[PDB]
Paper text:
In the complex, JNK1 has its characteristic bilobal structure comprising an N-terminal lobe rich in β-sheet and a C-terminal lobe that is mostly α-helical. The overall folding of MKP7-CD is typical of DUSPs, with a central twisted five-stranded β-sheet surrounded by six α-helices. MKP7-CD is positioned onto the JNK1 molecule so that the active site of the phosphatase faces towards the activation segment. Thus this chloride ion is a mimic for the phosphate group of the substrate, as revealed by a comparison with the structure of PTP1B in complex with phosphotyrosine. In the complex, MKP7-CD and JNK1 form extensive protein–protein interactions involving the C-terminal helices of MKP7-CD and C-lobe of JNK1. The carboxylate of Asp268 in MKP7 forms a salt bridge with side chain of Arg263 in JNK1, and Lys275 of MKP7 forms a hydrogen bond and a salt bridge with Thr228 and Asp229 of JNK1, respectively.
The mitogen-activated protein kinases (MAPKs) are central components of the signal-transduction pathways, which mediate the cellular response to a variety of extracellular stimuli, ranging from growth factors to environmental stresses. The MAPKs are activated by MAPK kinases that phosphorylate the MAPKs at conserved threonine and tyrosine residues within their activation loop. Downregulation of MAPK activity can be achieved through direct dephosphorylation of the phospho-threonine and/or tyrosine residues by various serine/threonine phosphatases, tyrosine phosphatases and dual-specificity phosphatases (DUSPs) termed MKPs. MKP7, the biggest molecule in the MKP family, selectively inactivates JNK and p38 following stress activation.
Author numbering:
A (entry chain G): 158 to 298
B (entry chain E): 7 to 32, 38 to 174, 187 to 330, 353 to 362
The structure:
């Protein structure tokens, strides 16, 4: 199933969200959907969910949705909820948002945070467009 | 032809024409004996290829391309069918092709002379030239989608990408740049290199890692090249440690080549030269397929004296 990254934070793909059972076992209360095409699981309250409507491409901008994204994760840990960040495959888009979240909360650089997520979920390979943007985010922080 | 039967192959069911006999596994592809041609053939099943918008467009292209293309170094189409009788019934497509004896992964692993490496590369390049001449750039050329016969003939199985194993993709693809024909030349270089070295040139589990092996070996691209990248890719790439890289003499020494070959010192320098012109990060300075075919290492082989309603629609032709 989906990969635990942190306590209360999971990183996965759409097959993970659509799987009622797996979702019930991990405790997935919230959903950050990072795709235009992947639908919300019939079982998540709208308010408990978030789409970050981005494509997996070289021209897409996923930097301006970063702040929003981390807050949504933070907010959901405050209510003591468990968040699944996903997109179609959990390889590029969602992995990018997870890493940004790691960078912020653990005071890590891109290189460090990428390695942190990569060790837990070895299939991650965000494109260089997203990685360049994450470097730009490293600066803001 | 309406004569169909079924066999359980592993976990799947193949339902094929009676002419195809004694199926054994090797999409899911099994081997069969074609009773009407008196030779073995391959049968590839495409199951619910319209399971989505994607499988559809890749299947339709492959299916169209396979039908209108034909060359000696591209796998030959023998047949196409669906065991289903209607457009509603429509579920699966079967592609019958000629069957080779091994894939290039296996062959790489064997003990090859210069003469055989040259011949495999030469065939590869003709296959590609033919594709480019038809306006097809492959962009996904790998040892696993190239098959070869016992006598060393080489066929290319697929037509590549539209418009996990990432080791043979050109830098242009990783860097989000535009590409042209010689993109496929980078893949050929990788394969060539693999054949000589005895292992994958740039083995990686993601883009970062891919790039890394690339620059660790060939060297960080010059500033002029960095400036060709879109701003974001450029900021990521310019942030990575610099590497000097190694000369092609150090990357591909004589010892790597088969040891007792006639004229191998010259043959190894020809191979190194060809490699040095193929594994070039800047595609505008990388050789073309036509220049490659004319290279001393390859040119021995030139002979002057010789020469969903849609899918379903396309299956019923
Ligand atoms: Cl993805």
């Amino acid at each position: 199933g989906p990969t635990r990254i942190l306590p209360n934070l999971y990183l996965g793909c759409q097959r993970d969200v659509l799987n009622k059972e797996l979702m019930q076992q991990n405790g997935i209360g919230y959903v950050l959907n990072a795709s235009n095409t992947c639908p919300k699981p019939d079982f998540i309250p709208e308010s408990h969910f978030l789409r970050v409507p981005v494509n997996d491409s070289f021209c897409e901008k996923i930097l301006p949705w970063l702040d929003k994204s981390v807050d949504f994760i933070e907010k959901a840990k405050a209510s003591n909820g468990c968040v699944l960040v996903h997109c179609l495959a959990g390889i590029s888009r969602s992995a990018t948002i997870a890493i940004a979240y790691i960078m912020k909360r653990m005071d890590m650089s891109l290189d460090e945070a990428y390695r942190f997520v990569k060790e837990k979920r070895p299939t991650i390979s965000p494109n260089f467009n997203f990685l360049g943007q994450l470097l730009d985010y490293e600066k803001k922080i | 032809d309406n004569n169909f039967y079924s066999v359980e192959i592993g976990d799947s069911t193949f339902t094929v024409l009676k002419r195809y006999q004694n199926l054994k596994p090797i999409g899911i592809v099994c081997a069969a004996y074609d009773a009407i041609l008196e030779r073995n053939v391959a049968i590839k099943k495409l199951s619910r290829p319209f399971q989505n918008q994607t499988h559809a467009k890749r299947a339709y292209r492959e299916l169209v391309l396979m039908k209108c293309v034909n060359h000696k170094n591209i796998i030959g189409l023998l047949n196409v069918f669906t065991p289903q009788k209607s457009l509603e019934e429509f579920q699966d497509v079967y592609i019958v092709m000629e069957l080779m004896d091994a894939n290039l992964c296996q062959v790489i692993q064997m003990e090859l002379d210069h003469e055989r490496m040259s011949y495999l590369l030469y065939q590869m390049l003709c296959g590609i030239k033919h594709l480019h001449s038809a306006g097809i750039i492959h962009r996904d050329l790998k040892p696993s989608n190239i098959v070869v016969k016992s006598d060393c003939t080489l066929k290319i199985l697929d037509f590549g990408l539209a418009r996990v194993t990432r080791y043979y993709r050109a830098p242009e693809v990783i860097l989000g740049m535009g590409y042209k024909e010689n993109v496929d030349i980078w893949s050929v270089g990788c394969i060539m290199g693999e054949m000589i070295k005895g292992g994958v040139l740039f083995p990686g589990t993601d883009h970062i890692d891919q790039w890394n092996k690339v620059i660790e070996q060939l060297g960080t691209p010059c500033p002029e090249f960095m400036k060709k990248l879109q701003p974001t890719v450029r900021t990521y790439v310019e942030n990575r440690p610099k590497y000097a890289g190694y000369s092609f003499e150090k990357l591909f020494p004589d010892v790597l080549f088969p040891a007792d070959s006639e004229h191998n010192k010259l043959k190894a320098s020809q191979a190194r030269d060809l490699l040095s012109k193929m594994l070039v990060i800047d595609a505008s300075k990388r050789i073309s397929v036509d220049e490659a075919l004319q290279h001393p290492y390859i040119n021995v082989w030139y002979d002057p004296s010789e020469a969903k309603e849609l899918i379903y629609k396309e299956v019923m032709d």
